[PDB]
Structures are given as C-alpha cells and as structure tokens.
Design a protein around this ligand. Sequence first.
Ligand SMILES: Nc1ncnc2c1ncn2[C@@H]1O[C@H](COP(=O)(O)OP(=O)(O)O)[C@@H](O)[C@H]1O
Ligand SMILES: [Mg+2]
Length: 281
Amino acid sequence: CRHFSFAEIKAATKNFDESRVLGVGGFGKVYRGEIDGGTTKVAIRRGNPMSEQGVHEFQTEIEMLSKLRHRHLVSLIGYCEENCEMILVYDYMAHGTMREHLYKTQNPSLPWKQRLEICIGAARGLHYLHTGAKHTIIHRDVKTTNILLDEKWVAKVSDFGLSKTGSFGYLDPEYFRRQQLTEKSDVYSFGVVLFEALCARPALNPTLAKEQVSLAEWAPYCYKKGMLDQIVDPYLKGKITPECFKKFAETAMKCVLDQGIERPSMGDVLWNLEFALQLQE
Ligand SMILES: Nc1ncnc2c1ncn2[C@@H]1O[C@H](COP(=O)(O)OP(=O)(O)O)[C@@H](O)[C@H]1O
Ligand SMILES: [Mg+2]
C-alpha cells in the first residue's frame, strides 16, 4: 500500500479541479484523476481530518483494504496522510454505482442478464469478505450505492469505512432486537439489493402506502400473494424466464428472512444466483 505525496495527488487531480468531481459524500469529495504519468486512472477521496468518524472511517478503510485482493472489491492503490490530511486512492470505476443504472437516473436500464452478472459479482465479493480474509469481515453497509461498476461493467464492492473484523432501507431488523451483528446482516442487506435490481425502486420510499414503504417487506408480501411480477421493473417484464424468476425471487426472499439464523450464507446465495443465470438461458 503505497504512500502518495500531496504534490502527487494534486497533480493527479489538477489541484482538485471541480472539473474532476465524480461525486460528493459524507467522507468528502471524490475526484477523477490519473497517476503514473497518466497510464492508470484512479478515484481520489479527500476527507476532512477534523471529523473523528471521517478519520475512523479513513483508518478502517486502510487496515481492511491493504490486506484484501479480489476481482469484485474496489482496490485501494494508496493514500496520502501528508499535511495530516485524509486522501484515499482507488482505481476508477467508470460506470459509477449500480443504483445510478437502476432508477432516478437517465442512464438506460440494464439488460436482465447484465443485472444478474452484477449481482453475481457483488455476491462473490461478499463471499470473499465472509470466507476469504483472515477472519470474517462484516461489511455493514451493503447497498446499491456501494456496488460500483468498472468500464467493462464488472461489479465491485466498495466503501469499507464501517466494516468490522475478528442505511435505512438496508438495516437488519434483527440488529435492533438481538443487538449482535453477524455476516447474516450482510446477507439481509444483499437480499434488499437483489429486490432493488428486480424492482428498480428505492429500498425505502417514505411517501408510499404503509405496506410498500420498505421493499424488504413489500416484495416478499407480493411474492406470497402471487403478485411479485406486478412490481417488477417495467423494462424487465417478459424478459425473465419463469424458472429464473422463481429461483431469483426465492433466493432474495430467503435473504430478507426475519431471523439471521434462517438466512443462507453468501456461498449459498452466490450458487443460487449462478443457477438462476443458467435457467435464464
Ligand atoms: N472507485 C471509484 N470510482 C468512481 N467513482 C467512485 C469511486 N468510489 C466512489 N465513487 C463515487 O463517489 C460517490 C460518493 O460515495 P459516498 O460518499 O458513499 O456517497 P453515496 O453513498 O451517496 O454514493 C459515489 O456515489 C460514487 O459515485
Ligand atoms: Mg458509497
């Protein structure tokens, strides 16, 4: 994990030109830049060291990502702590977040097979977090804005600021009851991602009728009542084979079960998604 001088960062971002702002968030602004004389494009996050959670989140991200390597996780190339600043350098995910290709966007809708391959990629990333590091890593912030897409549409899990080792629509309701957090909490949030990919609507819409506010409650309700097909993304209607639809929906339903101990592991989710992709052929 390489250290960047603050002069290298500023050359990469052309002194943090708002020309290069890809997006802004709680941690800070993210800039599009290039390093190694322009051969490598990078995303550069500038935090504010006066925030302790900004600093905590910065430190968590470096201790986690410096030890992980996986095709479906955003790679941390390095950081810059000079001037006691907080700069993180990742490779650039050219197509942004999964959310911005699902709804409230004017990007075109994603074909069904591409949505499934994105979910499969994210599942492999989470599977690696749960089974491939020294100890289980609970991401704690799986959501459609923390799955990024590179220029060949490969899905990568990102934003490791809240993860631990050793967002409203997505929180495991068992955590406000059992007060213990498990990798099954990632499985719950991922089940919500799956329904978001199918339904192309936010996980939490506070303006709706009481039954529909929470996708994690609404979509299973609709399935049991035999009407999940009516709330699917209009672009996807008619495009999902019946056997793929049943397998995808049943997998998603199992993920958002009430008790974590009844939920499948990510390995089981991943295999069932790959099986759903085979049934779509
Ligand atoms: N590696 C990356 N490549 C390209 N864009 C990125 C990368 N990492 C983060 N971003 C952008 O930065 C934004 C800020 O992320 P975050 O602070 O979590 O806000 P949000 O949760 O609303 O996405 C993301 O929405 C995304 O568009
Ligand atoms: Mg994010």
